Scaffold this active site. Structure first.
Site, mmCIF file in Angstrom:
data_model
loop_
_atom_site.group_PDB
_atom_site.id
_atom_site.type_symbol
_atom_site.label_atom_id
_atom_site.label_comp_id
_atom_site.label_asym_id
_atom_site.label_seq_id
_atom_site.Cartn_x
_atom_site.Cartn_y
_atom_site.Cartn_z
ATOM 1 N N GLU A 444 -2.661 15.798 -1.152
ATOM 2 C CA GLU A 444 -3.631 15.091 -0.455
ATOM 3 C C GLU A 444 -3.711 15.370 1.152
ATOM 4 O O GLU A 444 -4.997 15.551 1.587
ATOM 5 C CB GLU A 444 -3.202 13.474 -0.659
ATOM 6 C CG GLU A 444 -4.509 12.504 -0.220
ATOM 7 C CD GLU A 444 -4.465 11.586 -1.353
ATOM 8 O OE1 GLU A 444 -3.637 11.258 -2.122
ATOM 9 O OE2 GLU A 444 -5.541 11.184 -1.486
ATOM 10 N N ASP A 526 -5.644 5.768 -10.862
ATOM 11 C CA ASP A 526 -4.430 5.318 -10.011
ATOM 12 C C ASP A 526 -3.961 3.946 -10.233
ATOM 13 O O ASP A 526 -3.136 3.366 -10.973
ATOM 14 C CB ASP A 526 -4.710 5.872 -8.675
ATOM 15 C CG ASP A 526 -3.687 6.064 -7.831
ATOM 16 O OD1 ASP A 526 -2.490 6.213 -8.202
ATOM 17 O OD2 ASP A 526 -3.815 5.822 -6.572
HETATM 18 MG MG LIG Z 1 -0.950 7.614 -7.672
#
Ligand SMILES: [Mg+2]
Lengths: 593, 120, 120
Positions: A444, A526
């Site tokens: 990320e 997520d």
């Molecule tokens: Mg995650």
């Protein structure tokens, strides 16, 4: 069981009585469409059918038009004829339709309408003597002069029928207000091996070519129904974020064994426009929004069971056919009540097994679920917890017998470079040797080298996020050739990082590039509760995050998701078979809306 | 259950703890050692109970083929969680084998080793 | 040239790529492996042309103590530069050899290995 006869004529009004006797079994319903031609005399057909009261005859006249002369007349006739065909359609069975009457234009239009919307048996009436008097066709029938020819059964398209409800049944109108959705189809049919042989689920080749090109059309926001009915797969879902506020939070709180041990005073702060945030937010607030749940509330065993059951019910409600959950058994353990991490994992395993067994026993739709033991980083945090988690996962897999199973481990948390994946490369030898699977979340905001270590030291088969891969071409090359799946949550990354059409933003979602390059991308959710969006909404939002995406790239994404799941071979064959059959039915029934 | 029954009647009782023996195979399914170590760690993680898991045993054929210079990196895991390790290098073994069993496996207890006289 | 000539005729042709094979010489000079691999990393960089180098072959171990992890010091390069490798762990090799080959060389492919049944 009643057949409906559809016919049209421009100069030979007497074809309908001849066509009435196509099959000796007897014909029930007949309906005729014709323009305002003053030549036509409905009286002859009326007296012919008055001999059979059991047959209901409808005469429909194209008001305001007598004959096609130019473009506007043709399109007006075509629209009204299509509306009449939609209206008179039996709601269950395909009809019998003939087109002997009328000049080439109406016959061709009726043939195209039949090929679109289907017909039980379209055919042609062959009259040698073209009878004009009433007796003559009966004489020919006795002699056998009249001949009937058909080119064969024509199923047409399965489900386009609810257009009769999309367009309300209205007879008073003009050509000023027509619906150009059939011409929109005509344009879409061949407007555009980028998408030819990229077809997943080889059963996808059976739908009529109208579907085979419809799937190539760009995705739109109004595709919610098809996406919801589409079976999906979620591979990155955190259990500690399912219930975060509202009714789910109230239900999980109320099922706690000890209500006194929980607090009902703290609630996450609302974000304006959530989930569609107008301003990018940092990670810390994203985890803080899930503070109402996690470990401060899920210690209770009853809370555990209620949360697991609620998550499974929500997953089944979202038409998900397979999923893998991420859970931290150590984060919910409690030695005071003799609640060890192993006990927590065993409870979750038995709960999921019982739920799926109950769902399967009634032969309903059940969402197969497998676990993921997240190896939380715990920057210092008594770092032996990493080895503890690895041992727990190894023995949980070694338990073996059961339908719900632990399939791999995941390492994440504190994504900053201080806790990169270049530290624990030596511990992961045993977990890999015994037979487990490895997943590494990194990319990320990390350097383009940590991914290389993760894929080539831990041999991770999946990569969390890795949104910045586009700036490392060699990393793209190695990821593509090594067939390493990339799980990545659209809405969560949109809320955290920010992509167009975010205000004051220029960065674009690298999804479309990831697909056309060939990366095995798998869309996931997520944290459902914190993000406030399930898998269906995540798929739907792609039309805004990645413009120009087609409705078939989502099928390829789902196929990649099936490919990248740490599952056995035979279960993979069964999953593919069931899934492709289900998709075939879904796309056969979908565009009806 | 047995020790609790013995103690509840206020009679002499024998406290006993279990040791998970990492049986030596070295022929097939070598992941059995890692499986045993993970099982031992999870067993000691039980916490509760007057009878528990305190150590692991590196028994088996103590020959040169299975000395202590093979799995020390994996034993880092068991040593991280504060678990004792008992070795066994006492039959048909040379002094250096005992030596790096002591200093790489870090066996807090040692088995046999009758020929320790000849290595001052 | 052959592929281009066949394609210009618009008939049925066969696309072909080469894989440079590492020397099957454990004896003699050991720099042969290094020069072969360094030749491969240079050869991949031609770029133009229908034909290409796309991988190396790791045959050359005699199923003895060589195994496939001996040469491991030299293979941090081809994977970093984007090439591919191909093991040949056939002949008479134990499951451990194939395991270490596939988990150190990270071979995208594998040669022979007929006795894979006995190692579930
Ligand atoms: Mg995650």
């Amino acid at each position: 069981m009643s057949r409906v006869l559809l016919c049209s004529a421009g100069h030979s009004s007497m074809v309908v009585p001849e066509a009435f006797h196509a099959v000796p079994e007897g014909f029930e319903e007949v309906h005729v469409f014709t323009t305002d031609s003053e030549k036509f005399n409905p009286v002859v057909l009326n007296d012919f059918f008055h001999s059979l009261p059991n047959v209901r005859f409808s005469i429909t006249k194209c008001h305001g038009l007598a004959d096609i002369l130019n473009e506007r007349d043709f399109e007006f006739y075509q629209e009204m004829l299509w509306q009449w065909y939609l209206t008179k359609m039996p709601d269950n069975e395909l009809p019998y339709v003939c087109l002997s009457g009328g000049i080439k234009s109406m016959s061709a239009s009726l043939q195209k309408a039949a090929t679109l919307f289907g017909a039980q048996s379209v055919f042609h009436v062959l009259a040698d003597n073209n009878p004009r008097n009433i007796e003559e066709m009966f004489d020919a029938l006795q002699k056998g002069q009249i001949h009937f020819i058909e080119m064969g059964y024509e199923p047409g398209w399965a489900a386009l029928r609810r257009l009769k409800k999309i367009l309300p049944i209205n007879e008073g109108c003009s050509r000023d207000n027509f619906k150009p959705l059939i011409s929109k189809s005509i344009e879409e049919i061949l407007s555009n091996t980028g998408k030819s042989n990229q077809l997943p689920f080889p059963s996808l080749a059976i739908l009529p070519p109208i579907a085979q090109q419809w799937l190539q059309l760009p995705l739109s926001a109004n595709d919610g129904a098809w996406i919801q009915n589409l079976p999906k797969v979620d591979l990155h879902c955190h259990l500690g974020g399912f219930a975060t506020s509202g009714s789910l939070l109230d239900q999980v709180r109320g099922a706690a064994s000890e209500p006194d041990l929980i607090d009902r005073t703290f609630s996450p702060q609302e974000i304006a426009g959530w989930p569609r945030s107008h301003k990018s937010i940092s990670l810390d607030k994203y985890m803080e929004l899930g503070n109402a749940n996690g470990s401060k509330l899920l210690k209770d065993k009853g809370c555990l069971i209620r949360q697991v059951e609620l998550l499974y019910q929500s997953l089944v409600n979202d038409n998900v056919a397979y999923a893998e959950i991420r859970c931290s058994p150590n984060n919910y353990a409690d030695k005071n009540k003799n609640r060890s991490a192993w006990v927590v994992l065993q409870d979750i395993n038995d709960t999921f097994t019982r739920l799926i067994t109950e769902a399967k026993q009634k032969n309903q739709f059940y969402c197969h679920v497998n676990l993921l033991v997240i190896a939380s980083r715990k920057f210092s945090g008594d770092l032996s917890d990493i080895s503890k988690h690895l041992a727990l996962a190894i023995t949980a897999m070694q338990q073996g017998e059961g339908v719900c199973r632990i399939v791999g481990v995941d390492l994440a948390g504190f994504e900053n470079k201080e806790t990169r994946a270049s530290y624990y490369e030596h511990d992961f030898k045993a977990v890999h040797r015994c037979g487990l699977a490895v997943t590494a979340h990194a990319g990320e905001n990390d350097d383009p080298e940590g991914i290389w270590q993760a894929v080539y030291s831990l041999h991770a088969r999946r990569l969390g996020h890795a949104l910045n891969l586009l700036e490392a071409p060699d990393l793209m090359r190695t990821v593509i050739e090594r067939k390493i799946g990339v799980e990545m949550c659209p809405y969560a990354n949109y809320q955290i990082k920010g992509f167009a059409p975010m205000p004051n933003f220029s960065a674009l979602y690298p999804l479309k590039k990831y697909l056309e390059a060939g990366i095995l991308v798998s869309v996931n959710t997520d944290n459902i509760g914190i993000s406030g969006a399930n898998l269906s909404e995540n798929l739907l939002i792609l039309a805004d995050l990645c413009p120009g995406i087609s409705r078939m790239d989502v099928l390829t994404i789902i196929r990649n998701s099936i490919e990248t799941a740490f599952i056995s071979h035979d279960f993979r064959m069964e999953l593919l078979k069931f899934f492709d059959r289900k998709i075939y039915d879904v796309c056969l029934i979908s565009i009806k809306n």
